[PDB]
Amino acid sequence: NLPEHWTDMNHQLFCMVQLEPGQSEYNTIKDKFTRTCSSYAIEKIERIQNAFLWQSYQVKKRQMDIKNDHKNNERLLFHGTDADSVPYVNQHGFNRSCAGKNAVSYGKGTYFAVDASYSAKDTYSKPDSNGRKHMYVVRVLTGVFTKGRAGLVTPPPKNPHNPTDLFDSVTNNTRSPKLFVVFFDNQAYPEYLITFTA
Amino acid sequence: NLPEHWTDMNHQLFCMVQLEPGQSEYNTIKDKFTRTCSSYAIEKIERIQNAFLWQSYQVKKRQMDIKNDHKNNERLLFHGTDADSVPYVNQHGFNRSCKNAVSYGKGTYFAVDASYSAKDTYSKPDSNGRKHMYVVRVLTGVFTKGRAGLVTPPPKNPHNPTDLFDSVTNNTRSPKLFVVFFDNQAYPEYLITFTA
Numbered sequence: 393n394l395p396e397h398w399t400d401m402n403h404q405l406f407c408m409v410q411l412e413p414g415q416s417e418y419n420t421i422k423d424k425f426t427r428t429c430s431s432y433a434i435e436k437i438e439r440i441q442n443a444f445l446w447q448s449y450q451v452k453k454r455q456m457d458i459k460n461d462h463k464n465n466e467r468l469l470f471h472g473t474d475a476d477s478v479p480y481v482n483q484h485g486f487n488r489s490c491a492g493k494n495a496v497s498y499g500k501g502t503y504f505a506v507d508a509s510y511s512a513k514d515t516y517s518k519p520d521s522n523g524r525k526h527m528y529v530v531r532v533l534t535g536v537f538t539k540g541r542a543g544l545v546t547p548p549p550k551n552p553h554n555p556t557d558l559f560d561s562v563t564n565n566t567r568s569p570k571l572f573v574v575f576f577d578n579q580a581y582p583e584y585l586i587t588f589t590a
Numbered sequence: 591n592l593p594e595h596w597t598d599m600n601h602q603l604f605c606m607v608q609l610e611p612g613q614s615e616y617n618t619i620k621d622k623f624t625r626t627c628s629s630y631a632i633e634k635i636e637r638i639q640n641a642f643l644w645q646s647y648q649v650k651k652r653q654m655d656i657k658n659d660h661k662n663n664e665r666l667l668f669h670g671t672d673a674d675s676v677p678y679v680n681q682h683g684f685n686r687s688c689k690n691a692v693s694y695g696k697g698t699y700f701a702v703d704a705s706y707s708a709k710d711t712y713s714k715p716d717s718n719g720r721k722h723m724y725v726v727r728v729l730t731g732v733f734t735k736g737r738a739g740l741v742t743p744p745p746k747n748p749h750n751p752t753d754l755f756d757s758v759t760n761n762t763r764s765p766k767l768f769v770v771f772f773d774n775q776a777y778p779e780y781l782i783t784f785t786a
């Protein structure tokens with residue numbers, strides 16, 4: 393079930409693949425980034441090939457496709473993080489118990505941005521001792537979402553009289569979403585790592 | 591690809607099935623409980639048929655079987671909870687984000703002995719006196735002693751910080767509880783409703 397554009401991994405379960413500028417795959421990520429981060433320069437873009445993270449994520453995606461009536465349940469979003477977190481995210485993905493409090497909190501989960509500019513803030517993509525900033529491009533199962541509240545540890549119910557039937561994610565604003573919060577493991581696959589500088 | 595002992599669900603994805611007293615499955619689960627809780631009264635035992643939870647759990651189990659290359663990664667453990675939490679666990683399983691004692695880390699706790707889970711602090715009696723305890727398949731895998739404040743298991747090797755233990759315990763030689771720190775590492779298989 394591993395994607396056919398992935399490099400052959402010689403029977404290993406994890407690899408970071410450096411992309412080539414001028415390939416469509418590099419250029420669509422570079423364009424998505426520069427749309428709001430034109431004042432930064434990209435050092436490199438790496439494709440994350442993590443067999444176990446992919447399998448768990450693809451099972452969640454297939455479940456949400458069945459549960460939800462004909463929705464586009466997946467969005468491609470950004471996540472800025474510090475260099476110390478990069479090896480953990482590459483191997484294990486996004487853990488809500490490691491997440492910082494957001495400056496505007498819509499719940500206690502993992503935050504993902506519509507715009508690279510948001511994730512490029514030093515508060516998220518902290519410059520390392522060589523001045524490198526790190527941002528992931530992430531497949532996120534946003535599914536059916538509502539406006540969040542600082543108190544949430546899971547997405548709220550769709551209906552107060554059916555407390556277990558939940559929204560898939562929450563946002564800052566349902567009309568004009570700029571961030572999404574997910575509260576479960578394997579609801580986000582880190583697909584690319586962008587290393588960039590001021 | 592759902593287990594053979596499950597009963598037909600009329601093409602639905604979630605069902606709680608009450609077991610028949612005196613049949614093999616009911617007797618097996620009743621014996622596990624009465625090993626340490628023979629003084630309690632069993633009202634009923636329900637088989638939890640949650641296709642989505644089962645699929646996500648079986649994926650984790652296949653992954654852990656490959657990674658550990660050995661094979662006894664699974665233990666059958668107990669979890670007492672309050673009646674208000676039962677509908678959530680039936681649908682969504684165990685969630686570390688939901689304060690009882692967490693001295694061995696911030697995960698979900700499971701007991702080796704039903705008697706521990708049977709304490710009123712875990713299986714809180716409801717207004718009709720009913721107590722609730724799950725029998726749980728847990729991917730304990732390779733484990734180490736836990737400690738306060740862990741948000742994931744420790745690494746197996748300090749020079750490889752991302753290769754983790756699968757779970758932690760109070761005591762590696764003679765464990766009485768296990769903590770898991772990830773979703774879909776535990777599948778709630780039966781729900782025992784009982785009284786003091």
Ligand SMILES: O=c1[nH][nH]c(=O)c2cc(OCc3cccc(Cl)c3)ccc12
Nearest residue numbers: 668669670690691693699701707712767
């Ligand atoms: O069945 C349970 N349901 N919910 C729990 O939080 C729970 C917790 C639990 O160990 C907590 C603990 C921690 C340190 C020392 C000791 Cl001695 C005990 C055991 C069972 C349960």
